[PDB]
Amino acid sequence: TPWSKSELVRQLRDLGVRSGDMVMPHVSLRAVGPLADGPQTLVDALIEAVGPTGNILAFVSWRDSPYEQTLGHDAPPAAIAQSWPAFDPDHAPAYPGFGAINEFIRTYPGCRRTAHPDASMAAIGPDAAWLVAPHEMGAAYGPRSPIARFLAHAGKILSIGAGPDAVTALHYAEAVARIEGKRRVTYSMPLLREGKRVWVTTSDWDSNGILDEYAAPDGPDAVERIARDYLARTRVAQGPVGGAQSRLIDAADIVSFGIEWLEARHAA
Ligand SMILES: [Mg+2]
Structure with missing residues (x-):
């Protein structure tokens, strides 16, 4: 039998989601199991577990x-510049790779979207507009x-x-970490x-590996190493949302751990 909305609201409140919270979800729907009205119940469960004063922020991207098609070039190549929307x-x-749920958050009435195309975020709540703007090229997660x-x-x-690799907020840690040889991409x-298509070229920190050790094709990247180290020595609330094992993580704490983790292993 699929999970009802009030069931997930019950489970989210045992985890520690209180009224007025600001929650950022990373969901694997296959682990959650079948839902009564589809993935929308999890969205509805999140929005009522957070109350009318809380906010939801999701990394939706584009x-x-x-x-990939423009990486490394000083300007968009001709084939892609002429036709790309x-x-x-x-x-x-x-x-879709970040989650099938994010498309449901994006289409939710009243949801706001950030201007950054690759690092687009979606927000729902009274502070959604304050969260989404400004998002500018060259400051994807910094x-x-x-x-x-x-x-x-x-x-x-x-x-x-x-998985621990899905903690998007840890890109802020590698952005501000005082470590030598940080990788950048163009x-x-x-x-x-206004109404005209424009091409903008910028540089930012490499979101696929802040250093060569963490940018290897073989796993794992810097975000996965930090999150696993953090979880191994941190008391975090863990319970079942639907059929999936879940964790509620203080964002400011893990990012501080991530900065200290990166600076303790690389010189300035
Ligand atoms: Mg508020």
């Missing part, structure tokens, strides 16, 4: 991001990004059946300005 925040679907404001507002990372994104 399904058609030309990140601009990022339209109101209609651009979320990236200071002034939505993740930064998420950390300064007692945000909680809710992992529902997801890519181009097509943005809608």
